[PDB]
């Protein structure tokens, strides 16, 4: 049986992928770049703050000073952090709270593998911190998603091998990171976005302990 579940946060635990998108799109437009639509945003999900800005600049076409790059990343984060202040337990996605409870009752370890430096704040807003056995700090890894480092770190922080773990993700970059760690991915979203070569569910209500067991046994 699997011994740990490694959770992405944004777009898995709650709808904050939507807020990252809205904030990046507002930033891009302030600097005269309009290519940041929902289709392009699939390339930004799971990607670090600095890598996200670089992808937006690369889109069209475009270079800024080192000083301006720092200011732009800060401006987006300040806006995003204002947006999330009113997040509460009522915003936890369907199935997630019950899954956390059921995992703890079956002595399965729970670790956060989010690229977001705002992850700990969000878990506190949602009254979820006490369900987590570890949080892998994205500032401590040498390589961010799609590199596997953060998923490997999350597994190791709870004393489990990645190959004894399931990873839950909403993003192309994060699915690749789970694959390359050795853990088993279960995606949430559209196969049009995430691929036809892993198990994918349409929404988080499908993330039950029963289903994770169904998949692991298959
Ligand atoms: O800017 P933050 O809060 O550190 O987040 C970094 C990344 O965190 C990931 O969880 C998100 O999917 C990305 O969209 C985001 O860029
Ligand atoms: Mg995500
Ligand atoms: Mg605690």
Structural class: alpha/beta
Number of helices: 10
Structural domain count:
2
Ligands:
6-O-phosphono-beta-D-glucopyranose, magnesium ion
Percent of residues in helices comes to: 40-55%
> Which outline best applies?
globular
Number of strands: 6
- Looking at the structure, the CATH topology of the largest domain is Rossmann fold
Q: What is the CATH architecture descriptor of the largest domain?
A: 3-Layer(aba) Sandwich
Radius of gyration: 17 Å
Please give the alpha-carbon distance between the first and last residues.
12 Å
The largest β sheet comes out as: 6 strands, parallel
Strand content: 5-15%
Taken in chain order, the helices and strands follow as EHHHHHEHEHEHEHEH
- What is the CATH C-level name of the largest domain? Alpha Beta
Strand order of the largest sheet: 3-2-1-4-5-6
Question: CATH H-level name of the largest domain... which superfamily?
Answer: HAD superfamily/HAD-like
PDB class: isomerase
Keywords: phosphotransferase, magnesium fluoride, transition state analogue, haloacid dehalogenase superfamily
Assembly: monomeric
Entry title: Structure of Beta-Phosphoglucomutase inhibited with Glucose-6-phosphate and trifluoromagnesate
């Amino acid at each position: 049986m699997f011994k740990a579940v490694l959770f992405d946060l944004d777009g898995v635990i709650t709808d904050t992928a939507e807020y990252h998108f809205r904030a990046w799109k507002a930033l891009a437009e302030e600097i005269g770049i309009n290519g940041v639509d929902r289709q392009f945003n699939e390339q930004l999900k799971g990607v670090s703050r600095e890598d996200s800005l670089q992808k937006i600049l690369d889109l069209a076409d475009k270079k800024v000073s080192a000083e301006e790059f720092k200011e732009l990343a800060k401006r987006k984060n300040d806006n995003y952090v204002k947006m999330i202040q009113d997040v509460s337990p009522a915003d936890v996605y369907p199935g997630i709270l019950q899954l956390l409870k059921d995992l703890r009752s079956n002595k399965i370890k729970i670790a956060l593998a989010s690229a977001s430096k705002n992850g700990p704040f969000l878990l506190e807003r949602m009254n979820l911190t006490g369900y987590f056995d570890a949080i892998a700090d994205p500032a401590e890894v040498a390589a961010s998603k799609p590199a596997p480092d953060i998923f490997i770190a999350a597994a190791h922080a709870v004393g489990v091998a990645p190959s004894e773990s399931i990873g839950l993700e909403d993003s192309q970059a994060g699915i690749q990171a789970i694959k390359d760690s050795g853990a088993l991915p279960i995606g949430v979203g559209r196969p049009e976005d995430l691929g036809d070569d892993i198990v994918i569910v349409p929404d988080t209500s499908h993330y039950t302990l029963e289903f994770l067991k169904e998949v692991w046994l298959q």
